[model samples]
Target chain A: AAALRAELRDLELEEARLVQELEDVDRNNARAAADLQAAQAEAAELDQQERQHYRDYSALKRQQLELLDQLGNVENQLQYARVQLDRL
Target chain B: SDEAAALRAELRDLELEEARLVQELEDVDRNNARAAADLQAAQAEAAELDQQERQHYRDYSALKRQQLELLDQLGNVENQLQYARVQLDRL
Candidate 1:
């Protein structure tokens, strides 16, 4: 039995390495889960930011339309004034 | 003869232990493979979420740029409107 003893020793060594490998993989998976959670939170924040941009854009658009209408009225009044001066 | 019997008995016990170790080793290997796959899935999901966040930021920036442009346009229109009114008053 020296041969049997040596075989047992080798098998025990292999078992140790396998268990260690499993443990490391388990830890890595736990780390990955944490990272995933952080990414999700960041994405959620970005969603809110995008919505705010849309809100600001909508308000600016309405104000721009009002400015255009005001400009049109002023130009029309200026043209009528020039025509009246020419008539005189 | 007793020595021979005890040695053989010890060998039998060692063999049983070896069998148990082999079975458990297989189990560990299987679980390791499964755990590695789980890690890869998590990594992929995180990357995709990060990409989504980046894309959203890009869109927000573009919209903000548009808002600034609109503000500038409104200011220019106001300036022209005031100038036209001044010309009308002079006439």
Candidate 2:
């Protein structure tokens, strides 16, 4: 019994100790559960933030592409105007 | 410095809490082991008691058999004595 270190106590004390231990275990279990929940929540929040940023970045990229196309059109118009002026 | 000190204090508290929780879990594991051992001991004792009861029952049956044998021997002796008495009466 002494070698066990676990069986030294009486039944009642052992039972009471078990109850206390279970309570603590449950508390730890709760903490772990909450931590998992918080991690999931934070992950979801960060995912949303990242997607939003990606969407904004995509829109800005599209706008930049369109501006580049417009600049090409303006350059072509300028070249034609210059040709017509050279002919004049 | 004060803020760092406060942060350090908070970290210490967190570490201590974590340690305490870990210890409690260990205690639960230990208690589970203890309970299981106790239950095993109880079951063994019950099994021993059952074995004792079986032995008692075996002894009881043996005694009953011996009793029947004794009664049969006594009846045989009485019949023989009655026969001898009859012969004596005739003589």
Candidate 3:
């Protein structure tokens, strides 16, 4: 009977400890969920912005390349101007 | 003189066009790199968050299981305590 009382008291304390632990787990879970949500939102937003910049890069690069090709023609046209100036 | 003046304007315009192309190319090159860096940094951080979230969940689950097992053990102890008290009381 004495041993039984002792063990029961110990078990009661253990129960309290378990309750405390469960509450702690709940707290941590809530915070972690919120943090993960914000992080994911930022990641998604940044992902979209990054892609938009890539589109800008692609179109800008094409424009520059086309300009270079047209630039080659400018040299020839400019060459005609200079040579014709000297001859005429 | 008239032809020379016209040629000079054409050359000057061509120069301006070339300068604009140079700036455009520079701006695009820098912007592309900026985008690449941002994407890489964000991806790396997202991966970090994923790993941390997974670990937290796993730890929480283990704690919950432990709590369940302890509850069961406590229940059994209480059952035995009640039986023992009644026996001692009867004697």
Candidate 4:
């Protein structure tokens, strides 16, 4: 009976340690979830900025192209008139 | 005898559950590490794109300024030809 009691005591000790281990793991799991959520939110904000800036850049490029076309047209008109004046 | 037998059964059940829980803990640890790594990679990618976007924005601004100056110059040049035409009409 003494030996059996000792064996039960040992099992109880093991159970205590296992229970503690589970508790620790559960706590860390919650921490990990919170950390992941924070990181994802930060990355999402940056992603939104990236997309908005990209659109702005594209719009600017189109404006530049149009301006270049307008400048070229103006230069041609001036050159045509200057040539006409020189010929006269 | 029955008491000892029942104690043994209870111990066996606990040990089995302990082993299972230990395995679950290992899997959770691995998953946490993987999740952390993925988050780091995502953050890095976002940062890189942020840098590229800023550079592009700067280029856009400069082009806009250049376009404004060009428009002004074109207007001035066209005015020169109009003044010349007015002078010819007077002659």
TM, every model? 0.39, 0.37, 0.45, 0.43
Clashing pairs in 1: none
> Tens digit of lDDT per residue, candidate 1, span B1-91?
6655555555555455545545654555565555555555555655677886566555555555555555555565455556555555565
lDDT of 4 at A53: 51
State how far residue A41 of model 4 sits from its true place (Å). 0.8
Q: Which of the numbered candidates is closest to the native, going by highest DockQ?
A: 3
Local accuracy of candidate 4 as per-residue lDDT tens digits, B4-70 = 5555555555455545545654555565455555556666789776665565555555555555555
The DockQ of predicted model 1 stands at: 0.01
**Pairs clashing in candidate 2?**
none
- Chain B TM-score of candidate 1 stands at 0.66
Candidate 3 segments whose C-alpha is farther than 4 A from its true place: A77-88, B1-91
lDDT of 3 by residue, B29-90 (tens): 67767666766766676677667667766665766676577667667766766776676677
lDDT of 4 by residue, A1-88 (tens): 4544555455455556545655565565555555555566666787775565555545545554555555455556545545544454
Position B57, candidate 4: lDDT: 53
Considering just the first chain, candidate 1 attains a TM-score of 0.59
Say which docking band candidate 4 falls in.
Answer: incorrect
- Per-residue lDDT of B1-91 in model 2, one digit per residue for the tens? 6655555555555455545545554555465455555555555555555555555555555555555555555565555556555555565
Listed models, DockQ each: 0.01, 0.01, 0.19, 0.01
Best by TM-score: 3
Better of 1 and 3 by lDDT: 3
Query: In candidate 1 chain B, what residue range of length 10 has the lowest lDDT sum?
Result: B6-15
